[PDB]
Design a binder for this molecule. Structure first.
Ligand SMILES: [Ca+2]
Length: 223
């Protein structure tokens, strides 16, 4: 997250870190057994880390639970990032508590102009590299479909939305991928892509989770 703030320990209790020997992507806990992330974060060998603040220090509220199954969307296209969504099943259910909690799936799609909370342990520099240890947060508004398409001509599908600031300076970034975009208390986006981070006229692009609720529900009813 570039241009964000330190969230505060466990104030984003649905945020997870995906670990394969190192943090590599975020995700969102949607119930005690399942995490939503980006399909482009698929790796074999994923351990889900819940209750994290500093990902490099064991502070006492973590739950580390291996994935048993990962399910990339059936129509994921890794070239365009259309349908950039994945479900990860935990080997055992998380113990839900004040620091480890699920986020609701949406009933309706969020509205342009809505300010959402985006979070992660990704890069905090637009130019260069610095990865934080503690969770960072950013409030960013959903941009209109027309603005998003103007920013990325011929690349935005109905399963994507843009959020952020066209002047630059505030965005998600590498290492935030797969993490949450929460708007009115529901998981509306997944950190997916963008050209660089926090560059002028290149806002973040996010998987539009409201388009996937029936897939998510039938998949978790069946696995
Ligand atoms: Ca930790």
């Amino acid at each position: 997250i570039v241009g964000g703030y330190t969230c505060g320990a466990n104030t984003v209790p649905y945020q997870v870190s995906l670990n394969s020997g190192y943090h590599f992507c975020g995700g969102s806990l949607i119930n005690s057994q399942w995490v939503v992330s980006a399909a482009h974060c698929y790796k074999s060998g994923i351990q889900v880390r819940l209750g994290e603040d500093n990902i490099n220090v064991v502070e006492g509220n973590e739950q580390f639970i291996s994935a048993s199954k990962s399910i990339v969307h059936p129509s994921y296209n890794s070239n365009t990032l259309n349908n950039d969504i994945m479900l990860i099943k935990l080997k055992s259910a998380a113990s839900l508590n004040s620091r480890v909690a699920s986020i609701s799936l949406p009933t309706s799609c969020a509205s342009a102009g809505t300010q959402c909370l985006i979070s992660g342990w990704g890069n905090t520099k637009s130019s260069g590299t610095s990865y934080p240890d503690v969770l960072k947060c950013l409030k960013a508004p959903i941009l209109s479909d027309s603005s998003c398409k103007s920013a990325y001509p011929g690349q935005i599908t109905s399963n994507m939305f843009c959020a952020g600031y066209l002047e630059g300076g505030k965005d998600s970034c590498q290492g935030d991928s797969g993490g949450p975009v929460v708007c009115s208390g529901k998981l509306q986006g997944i950190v997916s892509w963008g050209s660089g981070c926090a560059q002028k006229n290149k806002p973040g692009v996010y998987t539009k989770v409201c388009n996937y609720v029936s897939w998510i529900k039938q998949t978790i009813a069946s696995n």
